Amino acid sequence: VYKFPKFSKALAEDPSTRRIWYGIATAHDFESHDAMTESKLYQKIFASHFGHIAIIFLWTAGNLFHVAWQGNFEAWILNPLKVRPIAHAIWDPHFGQAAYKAFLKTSSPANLALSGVYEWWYTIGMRTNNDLYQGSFFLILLSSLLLFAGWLHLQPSFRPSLDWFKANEYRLNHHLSGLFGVSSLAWTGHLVHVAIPESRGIHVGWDNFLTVLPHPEGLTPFFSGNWKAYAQNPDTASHIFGSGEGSGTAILTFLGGFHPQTKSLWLTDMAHHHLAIAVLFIVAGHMYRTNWLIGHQMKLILEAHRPPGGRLGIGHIGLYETITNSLHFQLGLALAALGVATSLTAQHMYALPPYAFLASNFPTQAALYTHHQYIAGFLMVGAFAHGAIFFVRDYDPAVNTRNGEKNVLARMLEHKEAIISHLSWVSLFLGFHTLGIYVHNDVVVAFGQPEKQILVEPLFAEWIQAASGKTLYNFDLLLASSNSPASVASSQLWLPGWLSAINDGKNSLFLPIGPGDFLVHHAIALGLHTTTLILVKGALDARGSKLMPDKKDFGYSFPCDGPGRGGTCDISAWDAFYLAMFWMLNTIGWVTFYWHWKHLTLWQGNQVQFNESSNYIMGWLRDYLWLNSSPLINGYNPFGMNSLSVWAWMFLFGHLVWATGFMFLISWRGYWQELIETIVWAHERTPLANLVRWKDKPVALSIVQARLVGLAHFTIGYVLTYAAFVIASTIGKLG
Amino acid sequence: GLENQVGFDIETGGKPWDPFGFAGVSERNGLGILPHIKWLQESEIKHGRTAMLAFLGVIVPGSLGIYVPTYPQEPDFTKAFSAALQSNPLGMAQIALAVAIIEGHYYAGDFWTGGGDRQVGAFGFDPLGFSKGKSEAAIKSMQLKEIKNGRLAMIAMAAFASEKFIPGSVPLLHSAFPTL
Amino acid sequence: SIVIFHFSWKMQSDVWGTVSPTGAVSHITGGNFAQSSITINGWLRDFLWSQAAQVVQSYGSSLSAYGLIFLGAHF
Amino acid sequence: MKDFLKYLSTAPVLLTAWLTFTAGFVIEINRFYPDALTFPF
Amino acid sequence: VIFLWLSGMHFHGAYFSNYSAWLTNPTSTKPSAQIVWPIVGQEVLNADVGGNFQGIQITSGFFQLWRAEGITSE
Amino acid sequence: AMLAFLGFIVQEFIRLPGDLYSEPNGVKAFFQVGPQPLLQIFLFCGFLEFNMHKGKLTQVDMFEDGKREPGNFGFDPLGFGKDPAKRERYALAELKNGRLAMIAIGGLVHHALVTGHATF
Amino acid sequence: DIGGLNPCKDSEVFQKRLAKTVKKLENRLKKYEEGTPPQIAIQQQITQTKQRFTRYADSNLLCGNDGLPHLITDGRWSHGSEFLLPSILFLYISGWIGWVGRKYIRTVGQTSNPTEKEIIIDVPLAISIMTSGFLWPFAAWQEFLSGDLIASDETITTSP
Ligand code: CLA
Ligand code: CLA
Ligand code: CLA
Ligand SMILES: CC(/C=C/C=C(C)/C=C/[C@@]12O[C@]1(C)C[C@@H](O)CC2(C)C)=C\C=C\C=C(C)\C=C\C=C(C)\C=C\[C@@]12O[C@]1(C)C[C@@H](O)CC2(C)C
Numbered sequence A: 001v002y003k004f005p006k007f008s009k010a011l012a013e014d015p016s017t018r019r020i021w022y023g024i025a026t027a028h029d030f031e032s033h034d035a036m037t038e039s040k041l042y043q044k045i046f047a048s049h050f051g052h053i054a055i056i057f058l059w060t061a062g063n064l065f066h067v068a069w070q071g072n073f074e075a076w077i078l079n080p081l082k083v084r085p086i087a088h089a090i091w092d093p094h095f096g097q098a099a100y101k102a103f104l105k106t107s108s109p110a111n112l113a114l115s116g117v118y119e120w121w122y123t124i125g126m127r128t129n130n131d132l133y134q135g136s137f138f139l140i141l142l143s144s145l146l147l148f149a150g151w152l153h154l155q156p157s158f159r160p161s162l163d164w165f166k167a168n169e170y171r172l173n174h175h176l177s178g179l180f181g182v183s184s185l186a187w188t189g190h191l192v193h194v195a196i197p198e199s200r201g202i203h204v205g206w207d208n209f210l211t212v213l214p215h216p217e218g219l220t221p222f223f224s225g226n227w228k229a230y231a232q233n234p235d236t237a238s239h240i241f242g243s244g245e246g247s248g249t250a251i252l253t254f255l256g257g258f259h260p261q262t263k264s265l266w267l268t269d270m271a272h273h274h275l276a277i278a279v280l281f282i283v284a285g286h287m288y289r290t291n292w293l294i295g296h297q298m299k300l301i302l303e304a305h306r307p308p309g310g311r312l313g314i315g316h317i318g319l320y321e322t323i324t325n326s327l328h329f330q331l332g333l334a335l336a337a338l339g340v341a342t343s344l345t346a347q348h349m350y351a352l353p354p355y356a357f358l359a360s361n362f363p364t365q366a367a368l369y370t371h372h373q374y375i376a377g378f379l380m381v382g383a384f385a386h387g388a389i390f391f392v393r394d395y396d397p398a399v400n401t402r403n404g405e406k407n408v409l410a411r412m413l414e415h416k417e418a419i420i421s422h423l424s425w426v427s428l429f430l431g432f433h434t435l436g437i438y439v440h441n442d443v444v445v446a447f448g449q450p451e452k453q454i455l456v457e458p459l460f461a462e463w464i465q466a467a468s469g470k471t472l473y474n475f476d477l478l479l480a481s482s483n484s485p486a487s488v489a490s491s492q493l494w495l496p497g498w499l500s501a502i503n504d505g506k507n508s509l510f511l512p513i514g515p516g517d518f519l520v521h522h523a524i525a526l527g528l529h530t531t532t533l534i535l536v537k538g539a540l541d542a543r544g545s546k547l548m549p550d551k552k553d554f555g556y557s558f559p560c561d562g563p564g565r566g567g568t569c570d571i572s573a574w575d576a577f578y579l580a581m582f583w584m585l586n587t588i589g590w591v592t593f594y595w596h597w598k599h600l601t602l603w604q605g606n607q608v609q610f611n612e613s614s615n616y617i618m619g620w621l622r623d624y625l626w627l628n629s630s631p632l633i634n635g636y637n638p639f640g641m642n643s644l645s646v647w648a649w650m651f652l653f654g655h656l657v658w659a660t661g662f663m664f665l666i667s668w669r670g671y672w673q674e675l676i677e678t679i680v681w682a683h684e685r686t687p688l689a690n691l692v693r694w695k696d697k698p699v700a701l702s703i704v705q706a707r708l709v710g711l712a713h714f715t716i717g718y719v720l721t722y723a724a725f726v727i728a729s730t731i732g733k734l735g
Numbered sequence B: 001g002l003e004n005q006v007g008f009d010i011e012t013g014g015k016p017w018d019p020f021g022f023a024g025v026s027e028r029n030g031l032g033i034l035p036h037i038k039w040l041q042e043s044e045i046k047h048g049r050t051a052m053l054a055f056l057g058v059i060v061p062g063s064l065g066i067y068v069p070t071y072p073q074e075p076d077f078t079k080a081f082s083a084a085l086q087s088n089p090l091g092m093a094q095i096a097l098a099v100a101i102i103e104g105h106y107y108a109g110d111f112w113t114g115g116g117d118r119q120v121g122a123f124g125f126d127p128l129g130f131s132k133g134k135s136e137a138a139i140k141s142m143q144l145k146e147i148k149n150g151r152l153a154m155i156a157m158a159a160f161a162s163e164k165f166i167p168g169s170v171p172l173l174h175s176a177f178p179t180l
Numbered sequence C: 001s002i003v004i005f006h007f008s009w010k011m012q013s014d015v016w017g018t019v020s021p022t023g024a025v026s027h028i029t030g031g032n033f034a035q036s037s038i039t040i041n042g043w044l045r046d047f048l049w050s051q052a053a054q055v056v057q058s059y060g061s062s063l064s065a066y067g068l069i070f071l072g073a074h075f
Numbered sequence D: 001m002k003d004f005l006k007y008l009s010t011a012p013v014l015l016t017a018w019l020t021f022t023a024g025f026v027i028e029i030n031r032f033y034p035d036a037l038t039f040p041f
Numbered sequence E: 001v002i003f004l005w006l007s008g009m010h011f012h013g014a015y016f017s018n019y020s021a022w023l024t025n026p027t028s029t030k031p032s033a034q035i036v037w038p039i040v041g042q043e044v045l046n047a048d049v050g051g052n053f054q055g056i057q058i059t060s061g062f063f064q065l066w067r068a069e070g071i072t073s074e
Numbered sequence F: 001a002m003l004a005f006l007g008f009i010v011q012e013f014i015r016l017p018g019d020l021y022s023e024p025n026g027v028k029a030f031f032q033v034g035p036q037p038l039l040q041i042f043l044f045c046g047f048l049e050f051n052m053h054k055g056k057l058t059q060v061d062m063f064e065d066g067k068r069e070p071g072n073f074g075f076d077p078l079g080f081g082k083d084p085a086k087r088e089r090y091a092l093a094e095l096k097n098g099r100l101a102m103i104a105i106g107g108l109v110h111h112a113l114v115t116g117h118a119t120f
Numbered sequence G: 001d002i003g004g005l006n007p008c009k010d011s012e013v014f015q016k017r018l019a020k021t022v023k024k025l026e027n028r029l030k031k032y033e034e035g036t037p038p039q040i041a042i043q044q045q046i047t048q049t050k051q052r053f054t055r056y057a058d059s060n061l062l063c064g065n066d067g068l069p070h071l072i073t074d075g076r077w078s079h080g081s082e083f084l085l086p087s088i089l090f091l092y093i094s095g096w097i098g099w100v101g102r103k104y105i106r107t108v109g110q111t112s113n114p115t116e117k118e119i120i121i122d123v124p125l126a127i128s129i130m131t132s133g134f135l136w137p138f139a140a141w142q143e144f145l146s147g148d149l150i151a152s153d154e155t156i157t158t159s160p
């Protein structure tokens, strides 16, 4: 009953099971630990970062090793459009003979790989199960390096100080230039040297790379300035990927669009992209001042940025010390940027597939988009939660105020009511009218008169599609016109490739849109606005409100303030995160439902099914869920089973976890404490069991813990059931 | 505030004509989101001068037939801009540069919240001594004449645009400018 | 809800139906209760998914009000 | 009939009467000019 | 209130029902005792319950109860 | 109502030259004339309403300051009403004629609806 | 035309939809007898369907590839009767409602028992205010000018 929460003496003195539960959930909140200083905080965070990167590299190495050992990578190379990639083998003693037979792939039961790693590794120039093994070996070596570094930087003479950790200019210069630019430069080097010849049949391994010229002229044009030579003779339109037939000699080109065979971006396009990004980031990494008297001091930049007329208060004067001294502000900024970035990855890796033969891998396309959108929602909610935490525990009004006037951040708490009221107005506006139009379509179609539907053509979005060259909406605007200056300017660089790809019905590049797209985009906007409303309200109201003008004194996460003053359930800022998680899950569900139904109709060919039935709710319920759930639920029946049996089991498992979350959310404490007391009496008053007694007094889960557990069940069930549905439906419908 | 500013005359009684009270919205709620009366008056002078110049530039070339030698002979203001933009790109570029320089030197951005060293449409610019030595009432009367002529030119240019868009919107227009 | 689900499925599968002139009994669903009501996947598929076909396909018919109330009750 | 008229002035009765009247004229507009997808003008 | 509800049920059976047609063909006519006004296209709810009648099929079993009571006329 | 009754009687009798103004029936003339002439009448009546009540046009705004005899627009160019002795009789006559004209305006409009030809 | 759509008067799928609906209604009509009310109702349904389709055809309505009228709400006055005119109508009506509600709230807010007059409406005063909302655009831009529309600093604020 002691010594487990070593970091908290208050918990270690708890005589109940709450100590164990809270010991888990407070282990990473280093700022709240006993005998805590800032130096130890930054050093522990640094070591934890090292361990985390080691974990990531070990996970990647495991994926590589299992593809190399139990996969069919080599067979998939020779026939990427017919051979289904294998993730890893299965050894489960609970299998019957039927399950073994159904999951049997080649030599052993195995799982199909939906991560798209086969296409990614094939694109970057891997052709052998020994290339994957080398990658796994190297990644385990890197993990060992990172673990050694993490141990080393906790040693006495190697523990960095607060000044080093808060040295913003040095870290920015190095991160930008070194990390981004130099990693892009090295990736361009690999892309060219290995990937470009490997796509043309020439093997460039760790033996013949110092003697195989990536370009026939060989670094002469680069120093000579004849950089056009690297773009001459690109890959033809009859080039077979991985073979020298119809190949070229160029390494950096503009082509635009996709490879005619793999239906993916040109490797020479991506090498040029990464070279340009490398140059730009290396240049941008010299901005801030270091030991050589030139550069920028960001404190001065922030302080000097006050509009002269005066509408942002005193400007950004106090922001430098605010961000530097708070790890939650930086964490929130990083999480918001990462969420936007992974939303970008999801939205671009389906419209512009970058890996060979990934466009025809429909289950992996759906899985990748869903995975990245869910990660995006999680990251955004985390960014807002950490902003709220910064408000609660790191924000100092004195730093952000100069002689009564407030800086740009402190002024966000002055018109907080205006911000929240207008977020509420936008949410109500969008919800009222999107639901009104959807229900109008529902009722009108149900009454057998679909012509009375309200169908709004998304002209604004179709205008953008025409601006990028789509000649489908008869707009003749910028790139849909051959005479506009936008078209004449790039008529010789990348329009022929771009136009040939955007004006193609088999791509996902700028999918044609209609009224259903309009309505679902408005639903998405409503979801985004409502999630933002909850999170922003929790962040701004974190330090106090009218119901609790001292909420900052109770911390970020506390159960309530009691039944007084009318009742104060879910009044903390943590509860705002807890409520906004449901809205994030709902919004990501809407986004992924829209994406998956649109792409299922596109792949099956019945795009008229979406364009007609997507305007009313029953259309969704009947033609997406009810229609495509048939292959999934018949993964095992009283007659047999298929390789989709695991997905049906996961479907039911997700439903069960969802409803257990419903348990933990609807039923609150107090009802579970008295029942536990009855159980305690029963155990204490029964023979043959009195010999065994608990060391920690069994008590009901706390209010905040119960909310967390219900949210965890809700989210896990949500994710599992939707993953099972999307994967099984795609597999069982599209062969 | 409008009682002590140039712009009102016998045509609208003796009071400043302001049906919508737009001159008094600057002092209303907000630090500044709606223009001050000084910004509105500078917009008056600028729009009126531009409208007078544009009326001359649609009347003289289009009707009288006077044209700069190496410029397109297009008696139509809806195409003359593009025609000269292609025919003499350097001339249009120099005109744009001169306009930008003139406006940047005479910047009116502190007029939005009220204030600044300049007056409403001061601009210096008295070459031929028309206001060399005059009574204050005479200068005010000349300013009022300028403002009223600018408003009239605004109305004339709006009428041009309306008749081009909606035919028959100005009945006497084609009988008062017989050529395009 | 479980009681009424049991009643509906059991009656439709093992009581209700039509009788042929020679005495052959054919039920509404066909006796699937005995073998497919013993798993949760069976309840999900052979009862909920299977018998929800009439509700979702009621649009445009005289039972469309039932589909509308289905959606509204979900809401 | 002094307190009965005050009872009819209560929020529920007034809201019920107003919503009944509102639904009434909406339903009757839609009966006399049905299937109006756009503005009649 | 209960008596008013029962009176409404009997009135609907008397005026807006196909009870007389259902009496002559209980095994082939579906009981209906509520007709729907033709507004906003909702007249599709008037189903083909049989007996030269259009309306909403009734699942409360009032027709069978009335027949068991000996009620043979509206 | 008085002006509208006189309008009926004159319209069925006199009418204006032109194809649009050729319906002896007032109800059908409301449709044949088109929206353009009617909307001009609507806007002119609005201008009159604004200028005659001098801004205060609503139930809560009018008579808020008092000093406004009900129905007293001051309109009397021909000078009938200088003598206060006949002023009360003129007011009563105007009220009675207005009420009678409301009843008659309803009567004429509904006669045109149930028959369709004219008033005669 | 706009957005690749075509007028519904020349949309073959629109006429196919009309023909299919009429055929279904006539097939339903076949199973009833003589001039009985069911046949009259089905005939009225057929007539209303034909009238609605004809009106939609002659309405400057653009139909997609599904033969359904699509709304052009980018702002152009050509299709102004689809969104813009109903938008103006709703803005007028909703501004009327909001104005009369605000006026009633502010009027009974200066009496002895403001809360009593909110559950028990002063029907005379309510009727007086409600019929005065036809000038809400003018009343709003006569109270905003006088500063009587917006509060300044008597509004309450939370602790931070
Ligand atoms: C060249 C020198 C260099 C390099 C390579 C690094 C590299 C790194 N440092 Mg580091 N550091 C440096 C110098 C350097 N540092 C110096 C000089 C200081 C002292 C001032 C520090 C202080 C420091 C601290 C205190 C910490 C690090 C950490 C890290 C690691 C970050 C985690 C990671 O793996 O990110 C990998 C990231 C990438 C490979 C690139 C990310 C790609 C992004 C997401 C895509 C963005 C593209 C685009 C913009 C998207 C938007 C679209 C656009 C249209 C807007 C990383 C390995 C952290 C860590 O984990 O420690 C172990 C940490 O806590 N460093
Ligand atoms: C790199 C990103 C990052 C980082 C560094 C942190 C770091 C931190 N967060 Mg944070 N957070 C993040 C992302 C991040 N978070 C995101 C994305 C969200 C939104 C979901 C949140 C939401 C959040 C909240 C709401 C809170 C924190 C808190 C904290 C602090 C303490 C963490 C703690 O006690 O862990 C405790 C760890 C746990 C309780 C483990 C939970 C594990 C979950 C339930 C998943 C495990 C189930 C697993 C999937 C099993 C699968 C089931 C199977 C059947 C399939 C710490 C500073 C807390 C704090 O006090 O901050 C000051 C706090 O209240 N964060
Ligand atoms: C971000 C835009 C921006 C800013 C902040 C400035 C700032 C300045 N300009 Mg300037 N200018 C700009 C754009 C801008 N310029 C452009 C595009 C041109 C045309 C080529 C000019 C031409 C110009 C001239 C000719 C002169 C100035 C001058 C000045 C200085 C003071 C006088 C003044 O403001 O009047 C000039 C005011 C303007 C020109 C108005 C510009 C309005 C811009 C275009 C609006 C942009 C706002 C928009 C929201 C930005 C979007 C951000 C993001 C979404 C991309 C001041 C430093 C003067 C100077 O040098 O003083 C010594 C001067 O004589 N400017
Ligand atoms: C004015 C009127 C209607 C006017 C209608 C108009 C202009 C309609 C115009 C339109 O239709 C058209 C042309 C075309 C349409 O598409 C558009 C509109 C615009 C809609 C009805 C009056 C209708 C007037 C009515 C019904 C009056 C009823 C009076 C009664 C019952 C009086 C009874 C008493 O007088 C006695 C009998 C004895 C007394 O002592 C006691 C009392 C009790 C006072």
Ligand SMILES: CC1=C(/C=C/C(C)=C/C=C/C(C)=C/C=C/C=C(C)/C=C/C=C(C)/C=C/C2=C(C)CCCC2(C)C)C(C)(C)CCC1
Residues within 6 Å of the ligand: A328, A329, A330, A331, A332, A333, A336, A340, A383, A384, A386, A387, A388, A390, A391, A539
């Ligand atoms: C609470 C809080 C927080 C947080 C916050 C957040 C979380 C936020 C988010 C945010 C976000 C999330 C934002 C976003 C943004 C975005 C943007 C800003 C965008 C932009 C874009 C653009 C600008 C584009 C443009 C263009 C186009 C459109 C076309 C193409 C080209 C170009 C580029 C031109 C913190 C911690 C800080 C602090 C405390 C408080």
Ligand SMILES: CC1=C(C/C=C(\C)CCC[C@H](C)CCC[C@H](C)CCCC(C)C)C(=O)c2ccccc2C1=O
Residues within 6 Å of the ligand: A020, A663, A664, A665, A667, A668, A669, A670, A672, A673, A699, A700, A701, A702, A703, A706
């Ligand atoms: C069911 C339920 C309970 C009862 C559930 C409890 C007490 C959890 C029971 C123990 C779970 C099943 C874990 C058991 C783990 C094993 C005993 C192994 C020990 C592991 C620890 C050492 C970590 C609550 O206490 C409660 C409190 C507040 C709101 C809602 C609820 C609620 O819904």
